[PDB]
Design a protein around this ligand. Sequence first.
Ligand code: ZN
Ligand code: ZN
Ligand code: ZN
Ligand code: ZN
Lengths: 13, 171, 62, 139, 159, 93, 27, 103, 32, 106
Amino acid sequence: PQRLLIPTVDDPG
Amino acid sequence: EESTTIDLSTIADSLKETAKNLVSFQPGDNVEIINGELNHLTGTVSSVNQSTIVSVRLHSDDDTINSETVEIPTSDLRKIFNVGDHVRVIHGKHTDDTGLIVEVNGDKVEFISNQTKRTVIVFSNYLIKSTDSTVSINESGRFELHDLVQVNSDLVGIVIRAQKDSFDVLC
Amino acid sequence: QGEQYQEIIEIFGDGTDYQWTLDAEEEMEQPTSLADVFEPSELKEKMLTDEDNVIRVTDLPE
Amino acid sequence: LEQMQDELIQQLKLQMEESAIRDANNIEQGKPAIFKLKLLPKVKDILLRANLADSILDNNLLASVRLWLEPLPDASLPAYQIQKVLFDAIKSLPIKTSHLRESGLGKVMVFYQKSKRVEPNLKRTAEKLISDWTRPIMG
Amino acid sequence: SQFPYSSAPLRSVKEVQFGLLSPEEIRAISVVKIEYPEIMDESRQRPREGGLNDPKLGSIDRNFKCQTCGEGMAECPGHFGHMELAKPVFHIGFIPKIKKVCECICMNCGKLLLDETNPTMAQAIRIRDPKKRFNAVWQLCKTKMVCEADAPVSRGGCG
Amino acid sequence: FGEMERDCMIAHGAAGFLKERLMEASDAFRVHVCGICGLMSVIANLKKNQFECRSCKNKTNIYQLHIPYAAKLLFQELMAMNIAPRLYTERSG
Amino acid sequence: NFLFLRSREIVENQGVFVTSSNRVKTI
Amino acid sequence: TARLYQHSSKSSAEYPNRPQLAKYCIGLAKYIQSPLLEYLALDESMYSLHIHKHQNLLPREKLIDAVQTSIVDIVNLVGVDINEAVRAPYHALALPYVCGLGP
Amino acid sequence: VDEVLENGLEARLKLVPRLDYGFRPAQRLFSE
Amino acid sequence: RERACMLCGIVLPGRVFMQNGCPNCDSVLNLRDSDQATVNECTSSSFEGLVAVGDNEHSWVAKWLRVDRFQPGLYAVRVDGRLPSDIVAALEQYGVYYRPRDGSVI
Ligand SMILES: [Zn+2]
Ligand SMILES: [Zn+2]
Ligand SMILES: [Zn+2]
Ligand SMILES: [Zn+2]
């Protein structure tokens, strides 16, 4: 998918 | 190709783009609404902000509605041209021609010119309501005002008035 | 995750509630007559009017 | 105090629904939508009031906001003033996932995002609001 | 008698009224819109139209004439153009005044933080001089740090 | 003709000499002003004998003034800074 | 022999009227 | 016809890199080579020539009709080579004045 | 644009010739 | 001279693609065992947005560009040109779905 790959808080800065 | 513009789709798209970009509004202009809930309503432009938001005061039989100003996008506005108004051509072959509107055939508007003093048919997208002509004839022709011009072999005169593509000569 | 995916679907919709509106908008966005392509005063100079075809088809000296 | 605000907001909700129905009927009868524009200043003044946000979320005024934002069946968009005021109010209030579930404003937001007659600035604000509302779900 | 004849009557200045220029006035008095940074067309004379040296803005050359009024260099006063900004910006001379006005009014519902019910505000209203009136109103409303939803009966305040 | 010389001519009471020094012996200029907006935005074509303030949309209420060219320059520079100096030929009260 | 003259009061042709030089006297 | 030819935009387009006096010489040579076609090339400008002393007393439509009938008579006297008119647009100026044809 | 070259840097085009046949001549259809 | 592989998004010199193939797309395009034809159609020298990835597994950028299963190196955000229909059908035969990186498909 593409929509699920949105950035979260725990993703690297 | 043995044909007169048999293909007219891209040409029509170019017409649409030129018609959309060439429209410019001024305060006090009478406009009509094409889309939206306020479709087929008349109103006067009160103020212009940037080039995409235009505040319009609508005109209607109810007094309470006539005291309201509504900001309307320029993409849903069409100019209203009444018979007997001084209008100046924006762009085209008849550019900078002024006169009084005579017939309003919807998209096409007919008006008696001021310079040539003859009826000219130009699309409504090419008209701006300018109450005065104030046309400057500088940088045109080959003749300054009041020039002594040789008309032909044995005729001479003086330029009295100058126009974009004609002259008035006093023999 | 599947449950939050279903929650996202419930909150934001699949679009079918307004897909028909979008189709109608695209239909009305999409659309030849030479009387509307160029000015009549330019058509007349280029002999493109109907009257020029009438003159050209009639069997008489112009 | 809070109960009076709730009663006033419910009365405003009923007035907004009645105005929407009247404008839809007038549009079906060949008349422009004027009632929504007339009611717009009072709705704008109420929405700009910050302390009423909790009462608005309790009374689910966002459902009627969605109803006003809902395009009519004639495929005609509402007036730009209504859309701008409602978008500004949505920005000014802390809309959560529960309130979105109660109101179902996400469908209309996705429609506004996908539509092309909508102004690009409104498109960008709708994209930002959709991103902000998807933010708590994934973390 | 060193000026060419004009049918406009000759008068003297009796009053000078100052003020700010509105965007509508700037657009209305303009003769052209400036949008091209390049001064010269192709480095081959004849400056580009819509540029900073448009020939409609006026003529500063002996042999050329203004394309707006048709007058020579000696007689043409020059004409203004306009330049639409993509985003609004502060006027550098009015920033403290903008700050004081922002203090004076409410940032959400564009209303003064106090009304005429306060007698001090009424006295501040009474003075005719705009500078002193603004000074008094500012000295009062600076303290007030909250818009009043109801009268200190709703005054329209957003709270 | 500096400021101190101007003060000496004021002390003599010779207003005509001061006006002649500062205008006829210096940058004397003629401008046209709209009678409504009071701005120097009239587009005058003297040989065509047509005057017009496009903003105010009038062709009849237009006057001519004799002012120093430096005053014209000052008013145009003020206009460039968004200030509107309006010159009127009558008093109001 | 024709003189093209400019005049203030003849508004019919913006002051331009044609006369022969034999018809005029100098001031 | 040379003095009107040198200012015509058709001549300017034909010879972009040449001055006005060169166009005047070309007009004189073309007039020597074919006076009729040089008169035809004037189009609307040939009604402003010195045709008759009292030509200004006629209405404009009468003068235009007289000039056009004279051109029709003279062109049909001369004749038009159809292949040359089809190929060379300069020689096609006399084709609308052929008997039975028009613009 | 009669033909678009696959490289994308050039393309064969249909034009109106400008020749004097023995500062540029005006465009006109090629007369053989 | 450098080209951007349309399928995986990696950027390598065109002669590297001709001699050694694409190190990731070789399993389905056989670029190492193919002529300049497949190099030209599946890799484009016109691109934008150079991307260098160090750790594919944990980089959110790699997941966003769908390159977290590929060899680290030079990558392009946008690649001009799309894969042909026959190559798309061949990939669908292998069971792999092709999502264009040209930006026109979203
Ligand atoms: Zn000027
Ligand atoms: Zn407030
Ligand atoms: Zn004015
Ligand atoms: Zn690859």
